[PDB]
């Protein structure tokens, strides 16, 4: 019945592991269009077309800070593009237009017969992630493009916290002890402003600003949650409803909140 379903039935163990069931390859985008540089990750054998997720780093940062998501998400059946921005000093709106430019270019490559992702993408099924200003950028993309199927920003930064217009299912990773984008004035008012969506707030206990980046010590839970959220909302895959909406009931989590998520 569900045509966007990919992969075998999830367990806690299969989502806590570093790799999911599909084989991953990557390539560097040859002529990046509307953004500085891109790396694309893709499953060779997903058994059908999959959605595309475009991930953006923070101010002064690079792909390295958010790369781990590439292998992790692609292995469970997604096309992931991680980007560098035109300038290290771009603010969240510019990060947004470049995030959407990356999705636009993944859609183009899906149509190009010489491209390693020829025919692998469902260009009607995309989502957005990013760290800090790239997180703020992810929220701006979702507000501007309600056709996105999912957002999952981490440690988000935006001097405007009102996202009340967002209808896209949104998972916010927060970092308890963030002193760059403190939760009390960033993540939390952002979460709290959204009244029209499936949403979730998941605060990493004793986490600093970088608590969700490559090399974090909570990859099991952060990665499980990130994959379950994209599987639930980008694939409509109700096999993942429990993993996506449940409280982890974990001492690794200092604050949990969810709404409109069964
Ligand atoms: Cl930032």
Author numbering: 29 to 290
Tell me, in the authors' exact words, what the paper reports.
Recently, the bacterial strain Ideonella sakaiensis 201-F6 was discovered and shown to grow on low-crystallinity PET films. Two α/β-hydrolase fold enzymes (α/β-hydrolases), PETase and MHETase, work together to degrade PET in two steps via MHET, yielding TPA and ethylene glycol—the building blocks required for a new round of PET synthesis. We have determined crystal structures of recombinantly expressed and purified I. sakaiensis MHETase in its ligand-free form (2.05 Å resolution), MHETase bound to a nonhydrolyzable mono-(2-hydroxyethyl) terephthalamide (MHETA, 2.1 Å resolution) or to benzoic acid (BA, 2.2 Å resolution) as well as ligand-free PETase (2.0 Å resolution) (2a−f). PETase and MHETase only share the α/β-hydrolase fold (2.87 Å RMSD for 184 out of 262 residues aligned).
